[model samples]
Target chain A: MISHRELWAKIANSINDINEQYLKVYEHAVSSYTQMYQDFSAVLSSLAGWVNSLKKALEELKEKYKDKPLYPANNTVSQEQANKWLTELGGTIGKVSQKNGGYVVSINMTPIDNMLKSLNAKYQAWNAGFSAEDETMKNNLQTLVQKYSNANSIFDNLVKVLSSTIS
Target chain B: LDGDQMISHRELWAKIANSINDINEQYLKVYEHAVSSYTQMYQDFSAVLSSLAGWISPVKLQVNSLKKALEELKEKYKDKPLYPANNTVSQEQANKWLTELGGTIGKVSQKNGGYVVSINMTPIDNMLKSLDNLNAKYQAWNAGFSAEDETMKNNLQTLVQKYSNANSIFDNLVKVLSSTIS
Candidate 1:
């Protein structure tokens, strides 16, 4: 028969091993979330950058055509007709420059800012809740969640808000 | 020797009980964190959904295993479960967008079939609802324990069995998402 000391110690070791497996699972969960954070940052940044370039292109178009009229004022179209066309063109060119309408332009600044803050809060909350050691991160996951009511919830809300704006 | 056998039996029981307790504590921590992470993902549904589908199956395994482990312990120990406290959640949909970017926007995410410019919100809503059911089941389990004195069995019922529907879909999600995501 196995000695009690040996059997009991083996049992303890087995329990510890199980605990270690769980620890790995938890760590994986956190890593996946971190990966998620990185991905979101990259996509959003690329989007913002893309729109900024578009805005620059619009600015260049307006600068090149600023002095020139959409058409000559003496044409059969008439000054009223030409001016109206110019006015409409000018509005279109002007908006493209400023980040107007649903595109990923300047208009999304507020939502983007909201998104950043919420993301930081979301990450900080997870760190606090799951980190193996005393959290080096600024906020705990529970604290962030409690204060913000889950990071994903905020992200979904922001996405919906921004998604709607993306005309 | 009766005395010797008795001593050995008592020793074995103590060691096994201690080991089980340690396992339970660790399981609770991870199980709770996993649930919490899933909950957090809801905040940014569209942002996370594309990535989340892959994670669901692996996480579902962890959830099921932990629930199973806990259930086994309950039967063996004939004692109350060790779980975290009440976690209330709102079934209300995460705020709706007033206006959608109507014209062409983002391209379709071949992975999820959501248009970049205009994602279909229906699937995301459905996922949130599924998670809500599981979330409520967990919270209800925690809510069952009364602080008052009890005459009969004080233990909670089988948690995993109660959330059977939640368990069934995760397996389905694995197959559904495999082809969807690269």
Candidate 2:
């Protein structure tokens, strides 16, 4: 009957269409995912560079702001306090130095803070983009895998029917 | 009607045979895509990891140099700035960065120590060579897919020929019976 041919033709044609469509999907899906991970890697590289820059800037700036020995070097405060304070100044210099180097230059870091905070902002921005796209990527991968499985199931059933009818 | 029967049978045979071929084609496409995509993506990922490893090696030493540079610079500056009053940093932050740096270097050393032990236990270059050989085998399979496809085609052809012959014999029987009855 025409009905038999019509039904089988529909199934066979649909299988062909799916296989072709999913072929393109496979290629596109993978490329987009690769691009995404590449983007993440790039951001991390940028962050790492920023850290190195901060480190170098700190070294140079520390030399320029060289510690002139506080007259009577022993006890400006408690020796412990004096030792502690000198240590503090160098770390503060490192932070101020970073202000001049990274994405934006700032006036001063009041409490030995600013470079990490600025880099943290850049990191947050990168993370925002990654987090937003993550869901879309997850769904896209799942759908493609599901489609692959569905196409295989249909092909298997179609083969069985064709074998029965032909034989 | 007899012509219609033969045509319908041929259509069914074509549909079955072509679809079987299509199934294989689809599977081949998936495998090819999977193999190539993973290999490519892994190379990119591996590069990023290698970049991280490289950055870490130099940066690790630099952190120490920064501390040394700080110590020397401090010696020079300690004389002039009234320790606490004119100081730019507080005692807390100084210890924090150094302590953090120390913590990091400690772990790095711990990890390196283990890795060095592992290297002594197994020659790393030979391990890498073995992994490279394994990688070559995967690439070789993908490159030789054409030969595999041909083998699949031949196997399928032999299998389908059996069913084709059965259909042919049955079609003749039906036509002969119909002609005699009519």
Candidate 3:
């Protein structure tokens, strides 16, 4: 038969080993959670950077075309036309409303197609002039407009995914 | 030596061994529950990250293309005159042009000032809340284990004391038997 002393010693060792295993698991849980939080923060920062870049590109677009007419038919289209178009574009893509000391951004693409159609008509009307300089301007402006729309669509999709993921 | 006394000694040792095994079993139960909770939380976190990664790539590409288009537009019009020719115009025409320019700049500036690009924090807030709940569950499991651990330690200490007393009593019995034989 086994001696009681030897058996008790073995049980004590087992108890210590069990406690050690629990401690190891607990430590791993702590580290894993810490890493998750860090990764989450990084994701948020990346999103903010993307939003900032899009805003910068829109600003540059406005600066580049602020003084040019939509179509050069005796310069009848006021230079203010470009500003109005951009302000309307800005209104459609996103809205900034003051909330609690900061602002909240709400995106709506409902009027985007209508805005694009009207802008396209202006481009087509100007294309009839057939002046090389005007033609080049139209091409650049049209490409920029399409790219801007695409970027907004992607941003809207991203926001939707993020919302669904967290919820 | 009586056979009945030997049986009682063996029975007492067996009881102590059984109590140790019971304590270990209880601790293992708590340990298993804690580990399972942690695993669930980990899986949830991983799923969210994976889903986000899938969407982020397209967003990045679109933003890059937008920037490139803007850069190309800027380069194409770099040397072009910003305003219509004023040299051949009357004073009235130039003044009107300047006034319109000022108004357009003012209006655009006002619009730009009011326009702010901000990320909605609702999703982030939801994520944070989820993390908080997970942490709470983890903490609750930790508490459960801690309580079980305390109980196990107390039970083990009591069992050790009982064994020590039994050993001393058995030693005394052996000494008595030896003296009688001598």
Candidate 4:
């Protein structure tokens, strides 16, 4: 006759085993989430960097365009003329009259747009999948449930545990 | 643009500053909530963990005691039960056997009261077993109620119903089991 302690002890051991297996999956999940966190970090960093660039661009625009209140002497700049001047100003920003367009240019939204697009592409390149450790963790829990459910329905028995088994 | 939609006209920088302030206020609210939720998520399990440590000690005490008692019982009475199927052993026969078995049980009984109450480990084990069952039910309830998709505020009533029933049953089981061996 199987004692109750033996039965419960076996179940406890099964639970411990199942928990261990589940934790391996949890560990894998944690590791996967570390990658997810990195993904999130990259996205935020890219967005923040773009935002800072925009802010800096606005700051430079303000600095360069800081003229006093318009007076009758200065000709009122047309929208087209203003846009052309802005574009030409963009061209002459950083290039030392040699490398790019035989003139200078600063870092502009056009290049930054390309950088943002590539960053977004990398940001989306992650998702969940069935790793071996994850599957093993899940299977262990289900196996315990299935084992008990099936066997207990018919005179399920628990084995006497050696001291070594308990430890 | 309507009259109200009219900008600060020449004072456009003021409008930019105001817009920044409004957007920053909104962002700050969201950021604070995120930080609060993260803190709670990390710390909330301590409630269960602290309670569970105490819960585990009693359970260990129970298993240890029951295992010891059962081991002793197994050693002595694996061949024969303490009361091996006897509906009517007369007091005279019991007294005689008591005398033959060194009469210490009688003396000890006398030294205490006319009767001695022995608190063994089996009932405690049974109580812990019931608690284990209750814990399993709690796990199920937690899973159902704590799903990210489901709100516990909506799901709590059904689980509460199950818990109330389980609680009453456990109380009764403890009462009944505690009296059985004595």
Candidate 3 lDDT score at position A103: 34
Top TM-score prediction, candidate number: 2
The residue ranges of model 2 lying beyond 4 angstroms of the native Cα positions read: A1-15, A21-139, A156-165, B1-182
Say which candidate scores most in lDDT: 2
State each model's CA lDDT, in order: 0.30, 0.35, 0.34, 0.32
Over B1-182, each residue of candidate 2 has an lDDT whose tens digit, in order, gives: 23223344445455545544554443333223323332333344334334434433422323343333334432442232211112234445433322322221111111212210000101112223332343554455334533433443343343233334333333433443344344
**What is the Cα-based lDDT of residue A114 in candidate 3?**
26
TM-score of each: 0.20, 0.22, 0.19, 0.19
How would you encode candidate 4's per-residue C-alpha lDDT over A78-156 as one tens digit per residue? 3443334334323321111122222221122232233333324533441122123233333443433343333232111
lDDT (C-alpha) at residue A78 in model 3: 32
DockQ of each: 0.01, 0.01, 0.01, 0.01
The worst-scoring run of ten residues by lDDT in candidate 3 chain B lies at B103-112
Worst 10 residues of 2 chain B by lDDT: B115-124
Clashes of 3: 0
- Give lDDT tens digits, candidate 3, residues B45-137: 344434443533522323333334334433433322112211123444434433322221111111122321111122223333333342565
